[PDB]
Structure 1
Amino acid sequence: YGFQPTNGVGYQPYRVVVLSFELLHAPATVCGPKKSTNLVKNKCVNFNF
């Protein structure tokens, strides 16, 4: 590569990371959390504890 300080767009170093999500027979294990709301009491509500 020919990275130079005056090189414009197209010649400068580009950092690239590729994420591959495979779903094979093993149980899924990588993913984010779920938002937890504030808890209420003494009111007819519905919930997903």
Structure 2
Amino acid sequence: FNCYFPLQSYGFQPTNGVGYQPYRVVVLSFELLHAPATVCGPKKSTNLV
């Protein structure tokens, strides 16, 4: 009484509605600190003349 288990399991079955269907989420955290920058976007490297 007044004591419960906090963790609960997500019901997953293919017959469940699309709204409750499990969705795998990937969250990218972009943080710019005082340290030097490394990761950058792609390159171009066009033709040479």
- Deviating beyond 4 angstroms after TM superposition, the runs of 4 or more aligned structure 1 residues are none
- Aligned residue in 2 for 1:39: 48
Deviations along 1:1-49, whole A, 9 cap, x unmatched? 1111111212111100100111010011112221111001xxxxxxxxx
Is 1:22 the counterpart of 2:31? The answer is yes
Identity %: 100
1:47 aligned partner: none
How many equivalent residue pairs? 40
State the TM-score, normalizing by the size of structure 1. Answer: 0.68
Long gaps (5+) in structure 2: 1-9
Contact 1:2 1:11 in 2 (8 A): no
What code does the residue aligned with 1:23 have? Answer: L
Q: TM-score under structure 2 normalisation?
A: 0.68
Gaps of 5+ in 1: 41-49
